[PDB]
Design a binder for this molecule. Structure first.
Ligand code: SF4
Ligand code: SF4
Lengths: 621, 621
């Protein structure tokens, strides 16, 4: 009920921003307003002959760096390191899941099992494990771990999951020098290329940026997605709820934050132990309430139906409620300001990873061999914090909103009858004109979820099915769009298909790493049709992205032949040639390009224009 | 004979800077003067919630980033990415040498052999190859390649060459979480840690920075050094010459630039073919003159006695001579301004690597399977450029200066009688008070080689033997310090030892990657003495460093227990805690620390003060 309303579209955010304003708590929006004044990407710090800056000064000076690099090279090198940082996040995510499966195969991970033995055999046989369908599971698991570790090596010509792509798409990557060879190798070669006096050509630098992101989507992310299903079960459609109202004043509230489900799944298992449940009652709690934040919340939402408290810009406001008893975090997108805001209350801020360290946090390092023991200790710290909660400062806003989740590729095919042919024929008729994966973050520079939900409504109204992943899940869920009754907000053709299957017009497909499910579905549809991915009526969008990670997702979507839209532009506008390559040049190279547009309705026209063109290229109506 | 004399201390540089000034050619010093105005390291660009800047403004604003990161985290994350970029350069260097040995073992590299079969067996047996001393060589080579590739993997607990370090040093790394596990893995985890909301603790970020650089020195660099000896021969002491006078007006001048000897060794072999030599005579050339630049020149200097034309800030002035007929470059430290300056003349600028691309250059991509064929084509392009040379613009300055090179650890031990005991007893007596490895680059912010040669004279005068690598070789060589007669410029004790062995007081130990030879020697002396590397009277210095690569070398020297001096400071002064950790905090952790001092005489006192303290700790005189 102030200028706070210009920061978010949701009521629970307005209620907590007013509560933070009264209690004198600075939020991300406050710090974003101070850092309002390097956005052109024409500043280089790669060596101490600089730092250099490229300008169009009237004197003609500062046109080149000290080494002689121009604006094209400097912008390309900064952009490549931007993509590499995003690929490195998904790289360690998949690597931690590889190490967890190996620990299960060796019997050294108490509490972890192989939840989906059927998927273990199918994935292993697909990647080349001999007799994967009939050998003992732990032996099959060990061979799959070897293949995955070799993709984090330096001897392969191409990643294992790259075989899912159509043949014409693989033959295109090979001719371009774009085929990803190793998940860690392409990250290291990107840092090598952007060193002084190495790669000084903006075209080859951008080609390697696509190759690095392809090592993310078809490598690190896809390995992380498929091993999570093997270790924790393949997600199936199920109902749950979102927004801050999922917190309970009468229960211990444990907020899991981060990305890796290896930690959050064992936290949930610890809260269900009888001795731990009894201890929560001794503290006077009716139950232990686990709620999810960001991607690790998407993980528990897809496989366990655990309610989600919020997304990126909601994590601070979740502690302002005064009901957060513990924040369990591993790594990625955990703003360090959470530690200071948790100090204002009783909230116990716990970190679990050697990579996710925070100055002033309670560190309980979790590993596969002691996860079951350490997570029990973590839940006890939450129960203890419940005893010290300040009752006069608890104000859980709003009421929870119903959602439906768990739409993996296996679940989508099961609703279709085990075959993509019903989905194809619906696209042939003209009921579903195309698919668009809406993915990405929030960003304080844009009213929270305003562009995410707007584009989602515009697309489903034009008979375009939306595949939601990442923090957009919270945006779509709180808009009432993740239920089968949301078909009334879709066009006539899409609504008829949704009511036939009992599914919503927006399918939740998981966390950010689960964007590999979209690649898997796009590769499966292009394979059955016999065409390239650049021929399918597909699209991708990140209207409110912020991280290096979303840029890497957008990059490997473009490199795979999916026209990708970005709300805010990357720090590349200081070079017209790099800008012309990203926006127009890539269209000839890989069959897709980036789209920068802050207007979500206009972006719906551009996404639909690409889709109708690809429908024409298929000779469809 | 102007203010040009304030840019370099050498006559050949003054002659070419005057020649470039007359011909209207802008040099690095010209571009350095324009970029005189991010040096504090308190600017962050890791996401598009920023870019943010940390300041001490009177209003108290801009103290944190949009995510809430303070000055400690931002400076630490920028410094970690700085170290990672340097480690990535040595990583790809070692990886290309692994791929070359594998191609030799498979018989798919025409022109390449195993030059040092004896060293192949010793290295392989050291790293764990079974029956490495008696099995066929190509089978032994294949097993060694497997071990090296696994160090570029993600399954090891520690790199293979880490066994050379003393046990107490390895046990120190393991307790600190500093043990390097994989060359590419530590680079990827550094980019993951520096993502938003991952590692937000300046201590753990710096600990991983040391671990990343240790993966360089004991991993990428050491693999690259030892495989180069296996493929091209172990260097032995030999005489050669330096400075621009090594170019011949009566011969075809081929300037090899970059780092990888896989390319420059085959260029040299092509210039010695009879049909190619005959073609140079047909063009009117008396011979084909190959000269080295930067580290690839150090490679050919150590193993072939090929004269060196110059170092970093000499590469542009080498083309101004008008006698450069071809520049053959692979990657690293090849300033893109060379392409424009070569265009001013007849010089043919050739690139050979997929990673080292330059807009406007003649690209002849070289690989092990076609190196012998492509390099012959490259030399023919140089002979052709000799026919188009402008005679009125050729002015080769100065006269060549004699040097002695090829002092590997194997050559040092051979001069000592096959045992380090003569070297130890000389340090016990007080003749050689300590060893200091002078390494690093040039930097336009400092008068060229003024601090490099000054410190070299100060150290040898105080009876401290200097081990020279990298671009400091050109500085020491042109100062007449790389000959046995230079003992007259050393103290009484050091001069007596040098005249006994017939060696100079400054030992040339190779290129930048050959800094692993210094680690190998420091580990060997600490092992025979039974103490830690932090107990040996050793030191390291980079008075005129510029690259991410020298910072990684300085970092893994500190992490190995060697007090390291830097002329210019890294971009870390915006955080006192990070500065206090690098300068003082690391002394308690790893037994050494960084030393920032622009005064070379003062740095000689600080290096000697550390050495005399370690001599006292050993109870020596
Ligand atoms: S790499 Fe070149 S442009 Fe970048 S800081 Fe160094 S000299 Fe300047
Ligand atoms: S990571 Fe934090 S400090 Fe860096 S640009 Fe993003 S919001 Fe600013």
């Amino acid at each position: 009920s102030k200028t706070i309303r210009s920061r978010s579209i949701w009521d629970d955010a307005h209620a907590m921003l007013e509560k933070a304003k009264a209690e004198g708590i600075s939020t991300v929006w406050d710090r974003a307003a101070e850092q309002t004044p390097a956005e052109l990407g024409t500043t280089c710090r790669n060596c101490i002959m600089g730092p250099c800056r490229i300008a169009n000064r009237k004197d003609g000076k500062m046109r080149l760096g000290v080494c002689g690099a121009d604006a094209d090279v400097i912008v390309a090198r900064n952009f490549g390191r931007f993509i590499a940082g995003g690929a490195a996040g998904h790289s360690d995510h998949g690597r931690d899941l590889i190490e967890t499966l190996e620990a299960v195969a060796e019997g050294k991970a108490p509490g972890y099992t192989i939840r989906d033995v059927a998927k273990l055999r199918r994935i292993a046989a697909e990647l080349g494990v001999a007799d994967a369908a009939t050998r003992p599971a732990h032996d099959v698991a060990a061979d799959l771990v070897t293949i995955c570790y070799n993709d984090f090596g330096s001897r392969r010509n191409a990643l294992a999951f790259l075989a899912r792509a159509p043949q014409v798409r693989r033959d295109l990557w090979q001719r371009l020098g774009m085929t990803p060879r190793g998940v860690d190798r392409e990250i290291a070669e990107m840092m090598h290329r952007t060193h002084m006096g190495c790669d000084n050509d903006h075209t080859s630098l951008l080609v390697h940026a696509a190759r690095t992101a392809l090592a993310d989507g078809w490598g690190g992310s896809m390995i992380g997605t498929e091993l999570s299903d093997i270790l924790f079960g393949t997600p199936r459609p199920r109902q749950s709820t979102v927004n801050l109202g999922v917190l309970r004043k009468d229960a211990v509230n444990i907020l899991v934050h981060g990305h890796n489900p290896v930690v959050s799944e064992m936290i949930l298992a610890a809260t269900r132990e009888p001795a731990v449940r009894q201890a929560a009652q001794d503290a006077g709690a009716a139950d232990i309430n686990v709620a999810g934040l960001c991607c690790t919340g998407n993980e528990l939402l897809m496989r366990q139906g655990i309610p989600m408290a919020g997304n990126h810009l909601m994590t601070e406001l979740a502690i302002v409620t005064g009901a957060a008893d513990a924040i369990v975090a591993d790594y990625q997108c955990i703003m360090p300001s959470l530690v200071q805001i948790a100090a204002c209350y009783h909230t116990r801020f716990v970190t679990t990873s050697p990579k996710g360290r925070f100055t002033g946090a309670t560190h309980v390092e979790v590993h596969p061999h002691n996860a079951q023991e350490r997570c029990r200790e973590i839940v006890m710290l939450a129960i203890d914090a419940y005893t010290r909660r300040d009752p006069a400062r608890v104000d859980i806003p709003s009421q929870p909103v119903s959602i439906m989740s768990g739409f993996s590729n296996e679940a989508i095919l099961e609703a279709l009858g085990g075959t993509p042919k019903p989905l194809i024929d619906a696209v042939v008729a003209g009921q579903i004109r195309g698919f668009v994966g809406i993915v990405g973050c929030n960003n304080p520079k844009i009213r929270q979820d305003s562009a995410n939900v707007t584009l989602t409504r515009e697309l489903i109204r034009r008979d375009i099915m939306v595949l939601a992943t990442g923090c957009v899940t919270t945006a779509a869920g709180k808009a009432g769009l993740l239920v089968p009754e949301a078909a009334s907000k879709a066009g006539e053709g899409l609504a008829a298909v949704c009511r036939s299957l009992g599914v919503p017009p927006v399918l939740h497909m998981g966390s950010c790493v689960d964007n590999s499910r979209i690649l898997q579905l796009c590769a499966l549809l292009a394979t059955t049709l016999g065409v390239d991915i650049s021929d399918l009526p597909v699209g991708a969008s990140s209207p409110e992205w912020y991280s290096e990670k979303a840029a890497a997702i957008a990059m490997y979507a473009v490199a795979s032949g999916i026209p990708t839209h970005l709300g805010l532009p990357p720090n590349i506008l200081g070079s017209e040639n790099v800008t012309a390559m990203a926006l127009h040049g890539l269209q000839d190279v890989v069959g897709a390009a980036f789209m920068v547009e802050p207007d979500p309705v206009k972006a719906a026209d551009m996404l639909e224009a690409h889709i109708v063109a690809r429908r024409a290229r298929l000779g469809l109506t």
